[PDB]
Amino acid sequence: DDPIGLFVMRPQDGEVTVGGSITFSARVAGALLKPPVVKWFKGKWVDLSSKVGQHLQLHDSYDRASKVYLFELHITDAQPAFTGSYRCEVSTKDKFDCSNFNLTVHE
């Protein structure tokens, strides 16, 4: 099957009800002197780090035992406009990867 890129685990499609909360995440193996770096997007160009607040938070962590980096995107009090196409981009010193996923907000 397909070549192994940077994602140990890719972000998945998600569904949430209006007012609900949902987490998206990515895992990357550290094997690397510096942590991989993540960016989350809505559409081609909206950088969600610019959108952090009552409805959106980001959290990055590392598990020493497994040497895996975890990147989380938390959406809270979901609104209908949050529906759509999203993307996770990860960089290391040597590689770049990305992964597309969708959010659907119901009700």
mmCIF file of C-alpha atoms in Angstrom:
data_model
loop_
_atom_site.group_PDB
_atom_site.id
_atom_site.type_symbol
_atom_site.label_atom_id
_atom_site.label_comp_id
_atom_site.label_asym_id
_atom_site.label_seq_id
_atom_site.Cartn_x
_atom_site.Cartn_y
_atom_site.Cartn_z
ATOM 1 C CA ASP A 1 0.000 0.000 0.000
ATOM 2 C CA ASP A 2 0.923 3.718 0.214
ATOM 3 C CA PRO A 3 4.280 5.153 1.300
ATOM 4 C CA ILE A 4 4.733 6.025 4.926
ATOM 5 C CA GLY A 5 4.843 9.774 5.385
ATOM 6 C CA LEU A 6 4.947 11.748 8.592
ATOM 7 C CA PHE A 7 1.567 10.754 9.964
ATOM 8 C CA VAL A 8 1.565 7.794 12.361
ATOM 9 C CA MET A 9 -2.100 8.737 12.689
ATOM 10 C CA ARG A 10 -3.925 11.113 10.328
ATOM 11 C CA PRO A 11 -6.720 13.455 11.389
ATOM 12 C CA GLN A 12 -10.100 11.863 10.720
ATOM 13 C CA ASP A 13 -13.444 13.132 9.478
ATOM 14 C CA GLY A 14 -15.681 14.200 12.349
ATOM 15 C CA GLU A 15 -19.306 14.992 13.133
ATOM 16 C CA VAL A 16 -20.682 17.091 16.006
ATOM 17 C CA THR A 17 -24.002 18.632 17.018
ATOM 18 C CA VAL A 18 -24.428 22.393 17.345
ATOM 19 C CA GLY A 19 -23.095 23.378 20.771
ATOM 20 C CA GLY A 20 -21.014 20.204 21.006
ATOM 21 C CA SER A 21 -17.245 19.741 21.248
ATOM 22 C CA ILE A 22 -14.873 17.643 19.132
ATOM 23 C CA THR A 23 -11.141 16.947 18.915
ATOM 24 C CA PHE A 24 -9.098 16.309 15.841
ATOM 25 C CA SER A 25 -5.558 15.024 16.146
ATOM 26 C CA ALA A 26 -2.401 13.930 14.383
ATOM 27 C CA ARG A 27 0.505 11.734 15.564
ATOM 28 C CA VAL A 28 4.078 11.945 14.258
ATOM 29 C CA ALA A 29 7.030 9.743 15.263
ATOM 30 C CA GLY A 30 9.909 11.612 16.792
ATOM 31 C CA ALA A 31 12.614 9.030 16.076
ATOM 32 C CA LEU A 32 14.608 14.345 15.611
ATOM 33 C CA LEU A 33 16.355 17.041 17.684
ATOM 34 C CA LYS A 34 13.439 19.457 17.385
ATOM 35 C CA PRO A 35 9.721 18.629 17.576
ATOM 36 C CA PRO A 36 7.813 18.404 14.315
ATOM 37 C CA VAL A 37 5.745 21.583 13.860
ATOM 38 C CA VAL A 38 2.003 21.600 13.028
ATOM 39 C CA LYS A 39 -0.306 24.017 11.291
ATOM 40 C CA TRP A 40 -4.072 23.579 11.057
ATOM 41 C CA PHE A 41 -6.134 25.159 8.276
ATOM 42 C CA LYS A 42 -9.741 25.651 7.276
ATOM 43 C CA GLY A 43 -9.778 25.695 3.470
ATOM 44 C CA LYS A 44 -6.591 26.522 1.606
ATOM 45 C CA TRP A 45 -5.500 29.504 3.540
ATOM 46 C CA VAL A 46 -7.129 30.123 6.914
ATOM 47 C CA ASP A 47 -4.521 29.451 9.583
ATOM 48 C CA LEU A 48 -6.430 28.345 12.660
ATOM 49 C CA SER A 49 -3.736 29.485 15.041
ATOM 50 C CA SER A 50 -5.168 32.956 14.269
ATOM 51 C CA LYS A 51 -8.614 31.775 15.420
ATOM 52 C CA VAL A 52 -7.870 30.490 18.956
ATOM 53 C CA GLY A 53 -10.432 31.517 21.528
ATOM 54 C CA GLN A 54 -13.867 30.476 22.842
ATOM 55 C CA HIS A 55 -14.442 27.955 20.044
ATOM 56 C CA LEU A 56 -10.975 26.724 19.137
ATOM 57 C CA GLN A 57 -7.856 25.658 20.992
ATOM 58 C CA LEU A 58 -4.641 23.897 20.004
ATOM 59 C CA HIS A 59 -2.442 21.621 22.122
ATOM 60 C CA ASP A 60 0.811 19.868 21.314
ATOM 61 C CA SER A 61 2.441 17.184 23.473
ATOM 62 C CA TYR A 62 5.025 14.407 23.433
ATOM 63 C CA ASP A 63 4.958 10.873 24.856
ATOM 64 C CA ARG A 64 8.481 9.919 25.929
ATOM 65 C CA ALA A 65 7.904 6.135 26.081
ATOM 66 C CA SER A 66 6.624 5.806 22.523
ATOM 67 C CA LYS A 67 8.559 8.821 21.137
ATOM 68 C CA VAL A 68 5.337 10.075 19.496
ATOM 69 C CA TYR A 69 4.305 13.685 19.081
ATOM 70 C CA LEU A 70 0.592 14.483 19.395
ATOM 71 C CA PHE A 71 -1.039 17.551 17.827
ATOM 72 C CA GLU A 72 -4.610 18.379 18.843
ATOM 73 C CA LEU A 73 -7.255 20.728 17.487
ATOM 74 C CA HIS A 74 -10.181 21.259 19.850
ATOM 75 C CA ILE A 75 -13.454 22.793 18.631
ATOM 76 C CA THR A 76 -15.898 23.872 21.273
ATOM 77 C CA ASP A 77 -19.519 25.053 21.259
ATOM 78 C CA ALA A 78 -19.730 24.120 17.597
ATOM 79 C CA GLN A 79 -21.568 26.438 15.231
ATOM 80 C CA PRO A 80 -22.977 25.626 11.759
ATOM 81 C CA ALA A 81 -20.384 27.756 10.041
ATOM 82 C CA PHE A 82 -17.632 25.452 11.341
ATOM 83 C CA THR A 83 -18.690 22.829 8.828
ATOM 84 C CA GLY A 84 -16.275 22.274 5.993
ATOM 85 C CA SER A 85 -12.883 21.181 4.676
ATOM 86 C CA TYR A 86 -9.813 21.322 6.995
ATOM 87 C CA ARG A 87 -6.140 20.431 6.696
ATOM 88 C CA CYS A 88 -3.272 19.469 8.986
ATOM 89 C CA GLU A 89 0.288 20.341 7.869
ATOM 90 C CA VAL A 90 3.381 18.987 9.611
ATOM 91 C CA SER A 91 7.022 19.896 9.069
ATOM 92 C CA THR A 92 10.304 18.374 10.309
ATOM 93 C CA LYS A 93 13.886 19.426 9.486
ATOM 94 C CA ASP A 94 13.705 17.120 6.489
ATOM 95 C CA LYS A 95 10.088 16.549 5.467
ATOM 96 C CA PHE A 96 6.692 18.125 4.926
ATOM 97 C CA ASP A 97 3.340 16.316 4.974
ATOM 98 C CA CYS A 98 -0.339 17.149 5.099
ATOM 99 C CA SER A 99 -3.697 15.531 5.611
ATOM 100 C CA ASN A 100 -7.215 16.605 4.671
ATOM 101 C CA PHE A 101 -10.320 16.002 6.749
ATOM 102 C CA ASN A 102 -13.848 17.280 7.164
ATOM 103 C CA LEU A 103 -16.091 18.513 9.923
ATOM 104 C CA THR A 104 -19.853 18.363 9.729
ATOM 105 C CA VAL A 105 -21.946 20.252 12.271
ATOM 106 C CA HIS A 106 -25.474 18.949 12.658
ATOM 107 C CA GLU A 107 -28.685 20.699 13.772
#
